Amino acid sequence: YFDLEDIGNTTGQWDLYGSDAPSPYSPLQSKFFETFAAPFTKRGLLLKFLILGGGSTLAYFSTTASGDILPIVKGPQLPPKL
Amino acid sequence: SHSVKIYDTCIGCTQCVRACPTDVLEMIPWGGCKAKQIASAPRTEDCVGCKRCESACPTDFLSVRVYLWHETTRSMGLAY
């Protein structure tokens, strides 16, 4: 009934489902976020920061009192033939 | 895409064409057999490689041979 070689888009599911909403905005509080979230918006630079943020994992394990790394002590079993 | 070939050992029974669901083959005027026809493979781009054509061939061993080569969406038979 409605196929138009002119517009190939409506013909296909090209249309954004009504879930799209191109409406206004949100409060001015954004002016704050835009200021402090800027260094993480660069990409690639952020890729690196997070990977080198893996330096946290090293720091957290080099220093860790309560993970089972001690026997605590025992007298070991010989044991099948010593 | 897939590579299909026809051989002069054909007898022009046209069953390979009727078997194809994508329309990869067709009949051709020729002087080699009594039917004076021969299979042709012009549209290999639409070939999916299912070998339905081979299972209709009556020649002692196939006159039409499908050689599965590079894969494409059409050959992969994808609808998405």
Binding site: Y1, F2, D3, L4, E5, D6, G8, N9, T11, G12, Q13, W14 | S3, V4, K5, I6, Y7, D8, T9, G12, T14, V17, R18, P21, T22, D23, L25, E26, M27, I28, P29, K36, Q37, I38, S40, A41, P42, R43, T44, D46, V48, F61, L62, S63, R65, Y67, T73, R74, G77, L78, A79, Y80
Partner: protein, 137 residues
């Protein structure tokens, strides 16, 4: 032969399905098929079930090409109906395939060109050979 071309035609009655086009159509390709019915009949429709055929030009859009032929080969049987389908593309364009020659591929026609015909006969193929090609040229 001159391709007839398709402009606008009504679609057959159906009501919807989940086997229709999806994204591929938008960005790669989609195939449409046209056939004329002497009666508002009922046909199976692949990728779904039950659709009324309609009477008139009848235009349907599908994907994979094969879906169109399946319908077309069922359309030629059961009902004595002629049909034709094309590949739409995403930016207009007019590629018309099948019948093409205007006479069915199974029926021998006068000027087609062989394309990939080997006059050697099978079993007489060679063995490689590190050079380009496989020997079934």
């Amino acid at each position: 032969t001159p391709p007839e071309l398709d402009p606008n035609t009504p679609s057959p009655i159906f009501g919807g399905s989940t086997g229709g086009l999806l994204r591929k159509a938008q960005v790669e390709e989609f195939y449409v098929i046209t056939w004329e019915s002497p009666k508002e009949q009922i046909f199976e429709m692949p990728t779904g079930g039950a659709a009324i055929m309609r009477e008139g030009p009848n235009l349907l859009k599908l994907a994979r090409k094969e879906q169109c032929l399946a319908l077309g080969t069922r359309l030629r049987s059961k009902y004595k109906i002629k049909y034709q389908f094309y590949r739409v593309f995403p930016s207009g364009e007019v590629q018309y395939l099948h019948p093409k020659d205007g006479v069915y591929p199974e029926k021998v026609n006068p000027g087609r060109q062989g394309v990939g015909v080997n006059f050697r006969s099978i079993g007489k193929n060679v063995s490689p050979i590190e050079v380009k090609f496989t020997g079934k040229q």
